[PDB]
Design a protein around this ligand. Structure first.
Ligand code: CHL
Ligand code: CHL
Ligand code: CLA
Ligand code: CLA
Ligand code: CLA
Ligand code: CLA
Ligand code: CLA
Ligand code: CLA
Ligand SMILES: CCCCCCCCCCCCCCCCCC(=O)OC[C@H](COP(=O)(O)O)OC(=O)CCCCCCCCCCCCCCCCC
Ligand SMILES: CC1=C[C@H](O)CC(C)(C)[C@H]1/C=C/C(C)=C/C=C/C(C)=C/C=C/C=C(C)/C=C/C=C(C)/C=C/C1=C(C)C[C@H](O)CC1(C)C
Ligand SMILES: CC(=O)/C=C/C=C(C)/C=C/[C@H]1[C@H](C)CCCC1(C)C
Ligand SMILES: NCC(=O)NCC(=O)O
Lengths: 207, 41, 165, 219, 192
């Protein structure tokens, strides 16, 4: 109902208020099964956080590429980044990333299977734990006042960032250049520069 | 009608009808795929 | 070659037979205007004969001392010589269709036996039931092997009537 | 019982109750009226589905990865000859016999499972490994050493759900493998070749244009 | 226990009092008592054989007598096997014979005993009497060193089957160029 007036919240989203950014949007009822919804909330959090990181990286690095501040490292398009040499080849970088993420993601998965059983490090350090998807990583503790409001901010920006990344890849396949280059291209006219006039999206027009 | 269809289910008529259908089918198969001596697949 | 039989595509007598039969039909042609119904019929016949002789040569059938195709009826001695379409594959095809018809009839008998007037449901067939069982008969290898492994296909001779020795 | 069926309005036969995973009441030929035959068919469907999922994966994933530009492996039909012509290639007969000799052991083990679903767990069978063969009460779902990650090993209805996902994916994979076989027999191109070909001209390039599907004699 | 394999978890109950136990049994292979009672002895024996094997692979190369792979090459090639530099004039058949006779009698004597005597035989196999004096910690020592040696022997075989070099040769090639001479760089292990 919140996501669309005169509609109706799909029951399993109705009384389940302890979810961030709950607006009753579930036209497909993927979250009808409670365990399915418990998994999907974690999937949304992971996708949203990784997409906020990735889209922030895309936008900042391409802004640096356009203006010019980061040197030969950043004077390339984001999708052409594999041509830079770096301190390592591609292969060992990929292998290192496999190892490190195996470690981190298995820590998070073990958190998921039995929430709260994996908080303690081999040195005895013990962190707190609040809610499943929120491990309480608060070095500056922005979590003691209006916590639901902060989770709402996080989730709304995460949804916006996932939308942004889908746009990034769709536009990159549709039109050439960096994302902000395309933003300027749209802002140039704008009544001709829009998704309709690409030859890649309607297809109904000009083959 | 019911009795007419019962008559059409009798052995004398249904047998003759089925033989006619199978004969017609073999005749059609041999008309379109003639002179087939082996099962060439 | 499997037993002194050169492939019909090589045998000279096979091509000679082709030649002679076509020449006979040509002699029959040379009497009608090549646009009349008899002439069209003769031309169609000649085309059919030529197609048959080319088809037989293509499939590599074996011709004997005379120019006539021969068939092989031994699995293994026909499977290692590329002649399984002669008897083995049609064997499978028949056995399948024969079993289909036999199983459909058998199941129809066993279905109308347990009714009020079983002797009536044989001279006045129930066409919907016959057609349903005719459709179910297509899986007859599966169902028949199931009934054999189940023991419900056959009947013990202690229950079948016999003659007084 | 009230579940969706293959044909809405046609009731399910009174032998395909509603307990088996993947049960949509589909059985027009009445092949599974016998209960024992139905168990054997269930087990056969599981085996066909699992082998077809493996095969269709090993067909499309290498094919699509070759298309984009990686691994550049041959197309599935000629992949047998591509290896066969290699230098240090095992002869076909010896290779087939090695494969059949290994599968003899494995498949007779699975068979003795299918009969009495606790057969292979008797002590003294293997060298201490016989415990992993205890089964899970249903043939075709061993568990134990199989299923290392314990997926669905929790809520029962969770295992029932994953069973439906598995069986649906397996049915899709077998249909797709029949498609691959029939497509390569007709059009001597690969699966992705046929896919990218049909999207080019759907009304021109289909199954009524290859000339092998619809008999040329008729037309 | 001392160890949890997965820091948070629930470990198999039957693994508690064993030496060097980390609850590592996600497959339930040793659930019944007999399977575990056999697998303990199998693992200890596997570890001892590994320790000796790794010692040999390191020693045949660190001293300067060649690989652990080329060992059996001088067995054929006409003949002549080298051991420190001696000729040991023994053809292939007599090696198999002598070793079969020795291992048959030895393995048929060590196994025909009781389950504890099959894996931990005091007797003359503890000449310095270290079998007493709290042997649980020493058993943990033996088992963990054996696990390390098993992985070492597995790595020897695999890195030879991948790069074709030698343990010390592979170590040197890695230490010289840690960056482009890894498992990730030879196109065998990591494919993508
Ligand atoms: C394609 C989907 C698929 C699904 C949904 C399942 C589902 C199931 N299988 Mg199963 N299987 C599937 C395929 C296959 N299985 C098997 C062989 C077995 C065995 C032998 C056993 C199971 C078992 C199980 C159950 C629990 C473990 C499991 O696999 O969890 C679901 C896991 C996934 C869906 C992961 C799949 C994603 C990814 C790994 C795919 C990678 C593809 C690559 C291109 C390669 C469960 C009902 C166990 C059981 O029933 O125990 C009681 C059991 O013992 N499966 C094979 C043969 C290779 C398969 C082939 O495709
Ligand atoms: C544990 C099993 C083990 C096995 C199966 C082998 C097997 C082998 N070693 Mg080896 N070694 C083993 C352990 C060890 N070696 C060495 C040190 C060496 C050296 C330095 C050399 C070998 C060599 C050899 C090969 C020559 C034949 C041989 O050993 O003669 C059988 C042994 C004897 C007849 C003497 C027995 C002495 C013993 C009772 C004390 C052979 C294949 C030689 C080789 O490869 O030459 C090319 C060689 O030069 N080994 C060490 C010390 C770290 C080991 C420690 O465990
Ligand atoms: C993969 C990203 C992802 C995931 C895992 C989720 C997951 C979830 N969302 Mg979310 N959402 C997303 C992206 C995602 N969302 C984006 C990008 C937006 C902005 C448009 C939103 C906006 C949104 C709203 C407004 C709401 C949710 C809600 C929910 C929850 C219930 C809905 C559901 O069960 O369906 C599960 C959804 C998926 C499994 C995603 C499947 C991905 C397919 C392939 C997308 C298809 C491609 C695309 C159309 C192009 C659930 C945990 C409801 C909620 O209660 O919040 C907790 C709700 O109110 N979402
Ligand atoms: C829109 C961005 C955003 C927002 C609003 C939040 C908000 C929140 N996070 Mg989250 N987080 C984010 C991004 C964000 N996060 C990203 C990208 C990651 C992946 C690295 C994480 C990983 C993460 C973890 C693991 C945890 C949280 C937690 C929390 C909650 C308490 C901490 C907090 O308030 O910090 C305030 C956030 C901000 C003030 C945003 C400002 C940061 C600037 C914009 C960064 C600029 C540099 C950047 C790299 C570019 C809170 C609701 C903790 C929690 O749930 O507590 C119970 C928790 O454990 N976050
Ligand atoms: C995340 C928000 C977001 C924003 C701010 C933009 C902004 C922009 N997009 Mg874009 N887009 C987005 C998401 C977004 N997009 C997503 C999720 C997709 C995948 C469907 C696309 C796919 C897309 C294409 C194919 C193109 C653009 C283009 C553009 C530019 C012209 C507007 C247009 O015609 O696009 C159309 C936007 C939509 C059809 C829906 C956008 C989604 C929400 C409703 C945005 C609010 C413009 C600067 C065009 C361009 O390259 O500039 C010349 C163009 O060709 N977008
Ligand atoms: C029904 C009667 C029958 C007869 C008379 C034959 C006769 C023959 N078969 Mg044969 N075969 C049969 C049925 C029969 N088969 C059936 C039913 C099958 C399918 C299981 C086969 C499968 C088969 C194969 C695979 C082969 C033969 C071969 C042969 C020939 C060699 C026999 C031999 O070496 O010594 C006989 C040995 C005995 C133990 C008796 C021989 C002419 C071989 C061949 O083709 O030779 C060129 C060959 O390899 N057969
Ligand atoms: C579906 C009916 C049916 C079935 C299952 C069988 C089955 C059998 N018959 Mg038999 N038979 C039948 C009808 C049937 N018969 C009829 C109608 C006659 C009268 C002509 C005979 C006369 C007959 C004789 C004399 C012998 C057999 C023998 C045998 C056995 C050897 C197999 C064989 O090749 O037989 C041969 C089959 C025929 C000679 C004729 C078949 C008749 C037609 C083709 C089938 C009828 C189908 C039915 C009309 C359609 C109903 C479909 C339903 C949807 C309504 C076998 C178990 C032989 C035996 O002794 O066993 C070893 C034997 O010698 N049958
Ligand atoms: C049961 C399913 C199945 C089957 C029957 C096959 C069969 C085959 N695959 Mg394949 N594959 C599969 C699944 C399958 N695959 C899956 C799921 C994937 C992942 C998507 C792949 C990916 C794949 C690739 C990338 C390649 C093959 C190749 C091959 C062919 C050669 C096999 C070989 O080189 O020797 C046998 C395989 C062995 C592992 C030999 C065992 C030796 C070691 C020492 C023992 C095991 C360790 C062969 C016809 C190769 C090919 O294209 O052929 C030219 C090829 O490059 N497959
Ligand atoms: C063509 C015949 C098709 C007949 C279709 C079924 C007839 C059933 C019927 O008419 O009911 C009998 C009908 C009574 O209906 P009942 O009570 O259901 O039997 O009897 C009659 O009144 C007339 C019977 C003559 C039927 C037509 C005969 C063919 C006419 C064309 C002559 C050539
Ligand atoms: C249900 C029912 C019941 C009712 O009542 C009646 C009816 C109707 C009859 C029904 C139906 C049926 C059906 C549909 C069936 C189908 C099936 C299939 C398709 C199977 C496959 C199945 C399939 C399968 C297994 C497959 C497998 C595969 C594989 C292994 C593959 C392999 C391979 C590869 C990888 C690659 C390479 O390079 C080659 C090869 C070597 C080739
Ligand atoms: C392959 C072959 O040739 C025979 C090997 C025999 C074995 C392992 C028997 C070993 C023992 C067992 C388990 C009990 C009685 C005697 C042994 C030697 C301890
Ligand atoms: N009764 C002999 C015995 O227990 N053998 C165990 C083994 O195979 O090590």
């Amino acid at each position: 109902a919140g996501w669309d007036l005169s509609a109706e919240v799909p029951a399993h989203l109705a009384g389940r208020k302890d979810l961030a950014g709950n607006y009753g949007f579930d036209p497909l009822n993927l979250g009808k099964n409670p365990e399915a919804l418990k998994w999907y909330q974690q999937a949304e959090l992971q996708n949203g956080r990784w997409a906020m990181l990735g889209v922030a990286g895309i936008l900042v690095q391409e802004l640096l590429h356009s203006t010019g501040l980061g040197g030969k490292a950043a004077d390339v398009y984001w999708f052409d980044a594999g041509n830079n040499t770096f301190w390592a080849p591609k292969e060992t970088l990929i292998a290192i990333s496999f190892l490190m993420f195996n470690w981190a993601e298995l820590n998070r998965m073990q958190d998921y299977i039995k929430p709260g059983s994996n908080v303690t490090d081999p040195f005895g350090n013990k962190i707190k734990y609040v809610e499943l998807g929120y491990p309480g990583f608060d070095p500056l503790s922005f979590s003691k006042n209006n916590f639901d409001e902060w989770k709402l901010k996080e989730i709304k920006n995460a949804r916006l960032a996932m939308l942004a990344f889908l746009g990034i890849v769709a536009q990159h396949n549709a039109q050439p250049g960096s994302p902000l280059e395309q933003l300027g291209a749209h802002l140039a006219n704008p009544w001709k520069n829009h998704f309709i006039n690409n030859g890649v999206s309607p297809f109904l027009t000009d083959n | 009608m019911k009795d007419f269809t019962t008559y059409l289910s009798t052995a004398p008529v249904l047998t003759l009808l089925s033989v006619t259908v199978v004969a017609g089918l073999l005749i059609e198969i041999n008309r379109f795929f003639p002179d087939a001596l082996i099962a060439a697949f | 070659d499997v037993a002194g039989l050169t492939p019909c595509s090589e045998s000279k007598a096979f091509a000679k037979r082709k030649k002679n039969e076509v020449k006979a039909l040509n002699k029959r042609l040379k009497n009608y205007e090549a646009d009349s119904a008899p002439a069209l019929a003769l031309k169609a016949t000649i085309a059919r004969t030529e197609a048959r002789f080319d088809k037989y040569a293509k499939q590599g059938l074996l011709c004997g001392t005379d120019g006539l195709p021969h068939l092989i009826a031994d699995p293994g001695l026909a499977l290692r010589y590329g002649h399984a379409g002669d008897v083995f594959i049609p064997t499978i095809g028949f056995i399948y269709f024969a079993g289909w018809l036999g199983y459909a009839g058998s199941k129809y008998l066993q279905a109308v036996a347990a009714t009020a007037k079983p002797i009536e449901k044989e001279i006045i067939i129930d066409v919907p039931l016959a057609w349903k069982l005719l459709w179910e008969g297509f899986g007859w290898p599966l169902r028949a092997f199931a009934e054999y492994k189940n023991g419900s296909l056959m009947e013990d001779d202690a229950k079948i009537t016999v003659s007084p020795r | 019982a009230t579940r969706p069926l293959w044909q809405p309005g046609v009731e399910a036969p009174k032998h395909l109750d509603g307990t088996m995973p993947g049960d949509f009441g589909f059985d027009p030929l009445n092949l599974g009226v016998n209960k024992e035959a139905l168990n054997w068919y269930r087990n056969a469907e599981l085996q066909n589905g699992r082998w077809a999922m493996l095969g269709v994966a090993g067909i499309v994933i290498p094919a699509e990865l070759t298309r984009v530009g990686v691994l550049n492996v041959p197309e599935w039909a000629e992949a047998g000859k591509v290896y066969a012509e290699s230098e240090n290639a095992i002869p076909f007969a010896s290779l087939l016999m090695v494969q059949l000799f290994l599968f003899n052991f494995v498949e007779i083990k699975r068979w003795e499972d299918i009969k009495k679903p606790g057969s292979q767990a008797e002590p003294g069978s293997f060298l201490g490994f016989e415990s992993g063969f205890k089964g899970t009460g249903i043939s075709g779902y061993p568990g134990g050493a199989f299923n290392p990650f314990g997926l669905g090993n929790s809520s029962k209805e969770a295992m029932d759900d994953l069973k439906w996902r598995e069986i649906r994916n397996g049915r899709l994979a077998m249909v797709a493998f029949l498609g691959f076989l029939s497509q390569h027999a007709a059009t001597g191109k690969g699966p992705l070749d046929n896919l990218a070909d049909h999207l080019a001209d759907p009304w021109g390039a289909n199954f009524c244009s290859n000339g092998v599907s619809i008999p040329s004699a008729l037309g | 226990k001392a160890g949890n394999w997965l820091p948070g978890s629930e470990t198999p109950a039957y693994l508690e009092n064993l030496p060097a136990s980390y609850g590592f049994d996600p497959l339930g292979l040793a659930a019944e008592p007999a399977s575990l009672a056999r697998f303990r002895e199998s693992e200890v024996f596997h570890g001892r054989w590994a320790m000796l094997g790794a010692a040999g692979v390191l020693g045949v190369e660190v001293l300067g007598y060649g690989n652990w792979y080329d060992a059996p090459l001088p067995l054929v090639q006409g003949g002549q096997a080298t051991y420190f530099g001696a000729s040991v004039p023994f053809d292939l058949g007599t090696l198999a014979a002598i070793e079969f006779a020795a291992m048959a009698g030895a393995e048929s004597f060590r196994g025909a005993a009781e389950p504890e005597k099959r894996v931990y035989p005091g007797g003359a196999f503890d000449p310095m009497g270290m079998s007493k004096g709290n042997s649980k910690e020493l058993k943990t020592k033996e088992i963990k060193n054996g696990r390390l040696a098993m992985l070492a022997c597995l790595g020897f075989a695999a890195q030879h089957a991948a790069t074709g070099a030698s343990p010390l040769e592979a170590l040197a090639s890695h230490l010289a160029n840690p960056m482009a001479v890894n498992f990730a760089t030879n196109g065998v292990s990591l494919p993508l």
